Amino acid sequence: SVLQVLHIPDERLRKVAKPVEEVNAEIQRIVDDMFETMYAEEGIGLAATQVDIHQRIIVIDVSENRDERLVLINPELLEKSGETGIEEGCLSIPEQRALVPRAEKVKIRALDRDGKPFELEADGLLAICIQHEMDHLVGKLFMDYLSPLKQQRIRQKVEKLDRLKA
Numbered sequence: 001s002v003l004q005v006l007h008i009p010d011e012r013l014r015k016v017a018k019p020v021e022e023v024n025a026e027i028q029r030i031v032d033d034m035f036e037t038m039y040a041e042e043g044i045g046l047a048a049t050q051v052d053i054h055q056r057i058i059v060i061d062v063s064e065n066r067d068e069r070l071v072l073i074n075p076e077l078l079e080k081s082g083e084t085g086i087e088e089g090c091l092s093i094p095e096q097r098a099l100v101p102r103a104e105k106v107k108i109r110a111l112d113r114d115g116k117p118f119e120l121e122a123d124g125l126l127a128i129c130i131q132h133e134m135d136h137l138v139g140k141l142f143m144d145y146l147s148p149l150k151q152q153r154i155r156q157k158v159e160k161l162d163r164l165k166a
């Protein structure tokens, strides 16, 4: 079932998510609810913190056909290198996009939907998405990489955008 995505400014988006102790039926229902919400909003990734669930869970689908589910429970970054960037957007910061510096390659370790560990070497868009989604778990948003002036602008814009759309 579709979940509600928080928008800035909401301090809840800055809470550091806790590690999942045991992947089970409940965790799995959350995983499914997250995919449903992500696909519904046409996003390519979604961190649990965005839907107000403070546990280290991320769902991703960077495919064109939109049928290639990637689940990262308790992700852990092992290596990262190179430099790249794209005009990132976020469901929590409606209508704003900004070029954010990211590592081009990134190797991680995580648990899948069944709680089994795997390691993944990613590059291109998938690498970027992972970095974006992982930042979400530690309360970091993509706007924090910009100059304070730009950050303030963004807050004013979303703040306004939301109030008018209510």
Ligand SMILES: [Co+2]
Residues within 6 Å of the ligand: 089, 090, 091, 092, 132, 136
């Ligand atoms: Co985001």
